[model samples]
Target: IDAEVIIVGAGPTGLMLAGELRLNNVSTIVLDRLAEPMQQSRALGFSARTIEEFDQRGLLARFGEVGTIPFGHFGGVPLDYRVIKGGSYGARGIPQSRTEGMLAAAAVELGAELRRGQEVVSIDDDGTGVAVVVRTADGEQTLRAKYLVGADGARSTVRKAAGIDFPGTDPTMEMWLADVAGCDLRLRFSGELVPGGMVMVLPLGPVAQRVVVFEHATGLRNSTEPPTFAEVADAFERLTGEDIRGGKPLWVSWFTDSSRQAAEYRRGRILLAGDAAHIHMPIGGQGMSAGIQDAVNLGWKLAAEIHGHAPEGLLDTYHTERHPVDGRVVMNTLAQRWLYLGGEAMQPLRELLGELVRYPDVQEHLVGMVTGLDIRYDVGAGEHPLLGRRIPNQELVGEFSGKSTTFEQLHRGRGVLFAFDTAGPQAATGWTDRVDVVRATPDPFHGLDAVLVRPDGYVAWVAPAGAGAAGLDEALSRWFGPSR
Candidate 1:
């Protein structure tokens, strides 16, 4: 095999997965059609939860200083996004291109091979190994791998070739967007609902801005191509009386509320991730955030499978767990579209939601819904609140492991068993090859003796005080397979 895994896109998700596979010592090859990396920024920032994921891998420090927006809106209704702990409107002003650059640099530094200007012609998963044919400057070439992943954009060739069903609603309306320089516009970060439609102007930097306009009366364009800068300027002038024609157009694009999800994330040896698996109206940077999360979730599991020690049904859990997460994103983005871009009929419901946002519980729920912080998996049966949830970055002081935080322990991309009690290390004896036993004093607030965190940063099991590793081995075997 040319590589252990072949990732079919060089976007953020694919690059991230490349880094993750390298962390597990898995040979990986990343292919992209473009000769060079993208210069335009499709996504401005990622969600708060994505920020934590980066922090877990010690990648956040490479980004320099990151700004977080405390206030944001859901479907044009304003709310404070800081209602939930460690929640905000995510990192502000970080472009997608920059994120991709960082991820690519890290992956390459970790020895993952990146082949640019290689366009995939076809993928053949023969139920034993996957073979991919690609066209390069040197002509056609065939590459084989143990598994294949498609991280391509919405119109994924892998998804189509795999014969997976992508069923969803079609576009009903269109939204135009453009990045313009030399435009001094007042920032409307959450967008402003005008008489006929909505208009948003976000500051990209000192002299640049991104303008997005959605006119309720306009239908989808007949052609799939992006709109002209003149058309976007005309819509902006008609909706908000703003003249952005004089500003230099950096990039012009458009999107619709056409939501779709792949029926299967995995089939035989071929799997899908990022936009290849799902797509929807871009709102609050959730699209990119969800894709990054998908890569993080699938990377280790795929590596484990290639390494031949993955627990039974572990590979299948990728679709079972992530499909619902992306499905919820598709559902909520569609709902937000109805409220933000709808005609006069949506006003009443928007007003009602506005009233409901005043309450703390509603605020937390909405904040969690959009920020991806409230994500909890069905790991197992346990009344412990931290079960199936990402462990918080709490400072732990210990005699053996010294002082560290939860995220600091996860930098190596291995499962960590935080043993608060004396018997904690003894219980995890046999799985030390795949799991790291960290002797740390637990924070008094949680009142837990031991916790098992998966490589993906989610808690798989927890044992309270007086219960020393009662179900620790079972949880370990269930996730990491039998002890080595």
Candidate 2:
């Protein structure tokens, strides 16, 4: 095999998965058709949970100084994302290209191979392995690997080759966006709802700004071609009466409300992640972030499978766990589009939601949903609140690996068992090869005796104050295969 895993696309998802697989000692190769990294700041930033995911891998500080917004919106209504702990709009103004650059550099440093200018033309996944044929400048080449992952964008060639079904709502409207250099418009961070439509202005850099305009009357475009800058300017003027046609247009693009999810994330030896698995309206900057989460969730599981130590049904959990999460993203984005971009007919529901968001529970739910802070998986039958939820960054003083935070311990991409009782470390003895048993004194807030944290940062098992690692072995075998 050329490599244990072959990831198609070098965007945030593929690069991140490369880093993850490499951490688990899996030989991984990434292929991208583009010779150079994208320069456009396509997605301005990621969501709140993505921030924590970056921190878990110790990749956040690499972005230099980061900024976060305390408040954002849901369906055009104002929302204070700070309603939940460690929640916010996310790292602000860092472009998608910048995020990819960071992930790519990290993956390369971790010994993952990245080959550019290699366009995959076909993928054939037999029962045991996958064969990918690619076209390059020189000629065609075929690479074989145990698994192939499609991280390509919405038009995923791997998904098509695998015969996966993509089903969702078709696009109903079009929104125009242009980055202009000299349009001195006020920064409408969350967008302004005008009489005819909505207009948003976001600072791109010191010199340019990203302007997004959506006029309700102008529905989906008939042609496939992108709109000219004049058309965007015309729409901007029609809605807000803003004359900015003289400004230099740096970049122009358009998107729609179309949301889709693949029927199956995994088809035999071929799998899909990121936009290849799901597509949605870019509401609350959730699209790329959701894809990043998908990469993290699938990486360790796939690595375990390739290493031949994965528990039964481990890889299948990737679909069962992530599919629903991504489905929620599709649902919420479409709902938001209905409220934020719908015509005057949507005002009544908008006003109702505006009032509903005033309740603390409603605010918490929306903030959690958008920021991905409230996602809880069904790890097992347990009553602990932390069970199945991503563990918060807790400070710890370890017995062996001393003086590190919870996220710092996870940087190596191993399952972490925070052992507070004397028996905790001993119970995890046989599984030390795959799970790290840290006898640490954690923050005293929750009074947990022991907690098993999966590589993706979710709590798979927890022992109460007096239980003393009661189910440690079962949890270990459940996630990391049998003890060595």
Candidate 3:
């Protein structure tokens, strides 16, 4: 095999997966069609969940150095990550291009190689492995690998070659996107722009703002030709009642709201991730974040499989866990588009709902939904509230005072058993070899008496305030594989 894993794209999803694999000492070859790294920013933000994931890998400092502003949902629906009740991090705003650049650099630093201007033309998947054919600077070549990941964009060649079916609704509306320099549009909402197609101006840096114009005109579907910048400018004027003509145009493009998901994420040894597996309208800035999460979810499993420590059914959970999450995101984005971009008849209702979301409960729900801090996997035997939820990064009073650490830090290539103190019995006696045990006294923030964390950061089991070890072994074996 040319490499242990062959990633089909160099976008955020592929690059993140490559970085995780490299961290695990797994060999990978990442390929993209463009001659250089993508400079045009498409998806332009990250949620709190994604920020937590990056922080766990000790990569959040780079994003912090880049700096980020906190922006919430449209129509005054703010996203408050502090209400998540158990974490200290919030969503960080960074351009998609910058995030991908950081991931690519990190992957390379970890010895993963990326081949730009190389396109994978076809893939042949045998039951055991995959043979990928690519057109590169040296002409066509066939590369064999133990595993193949399709991170290519929505129109994925690898998905098609693997005979996977992408089922979803047709596009209902279109929007114009322009990254311009010297456009000064403050973020505000008024009655003139009431409902149906609104303009979103995101401050990219100290100098630029990304302008997005959503219009519901007929036949506004995506086109292969260049976007009509003049028409876009006209739409901006009509919607915002201002002429944004003085700015220098960096790039202009058009997109539609089309939601779809592959019937299955994996087909034999060839798997799918990122937009190749699922796509939705750019609502709530979850597109790239969700894809990056997909990469994070799949990376550890693939590494374990390659290292021969993975159980028989371990890889199957990727699809089982992520497919539902992707489906919900697509559905929610579609609903948001309909509520915000439907005909004039729905404007009053949309405005009312927007206003209602300002309430405390509604605001918390919206924050949970967009920040992805509320995502829970179904991995435990009994119904525990902490089961399948993210483990909080609580501060410990012992040894590591002031310096706080999240459960994510403990998930280094293995499962973690977090006990409140050393006096407690071992949580999972039978599965101790497969899981790492950490003893710490409870802090004020995470009052979790006892919890078992999976490698992917989900809490697999939680004991009550004084409950002894009961189902720890079953929970451990279920998520981290049978006892070694």
Per-residue lDDT of candidate 2, residues 144-209 (tens digit):
999999999899999998899999988888888989998788899988899888999999888789
Off by over 4 Å in 2: 399-402, 443-445
Clashing pairs for model 1 are none
Candidate 3's TM-score:
0.90
Model 3 sits at a Cα RMSD from the real structure of: 3.0
Candidate 3 per-residue lDDT over residues 1-484, each given as its tens digit: 9899999999999998998888777899999989998778786667677877777676666666633334455333344446656322234347788888888888898889999988999898776778988898878989888999999989999999889999999877777867777877774421124344678776667777767787655455456775666777887877777777888777888777789999999888889998999988876457887887899889878987888877777789899999998888787777767766676766786678777876878767666676677788887456666678877677544444444465435535466777774422454665665576666665322445778877667887877776666667667666666665
Error of 1 at 60 (Å): 1.2
Note the residue pairs that clash in candidate 2: none
lDDT of 2: 0.89
- Candidates sorted by lDDT, best first: 2, 1, 3
RMSD of each: 1.4, 1.4, 3.0
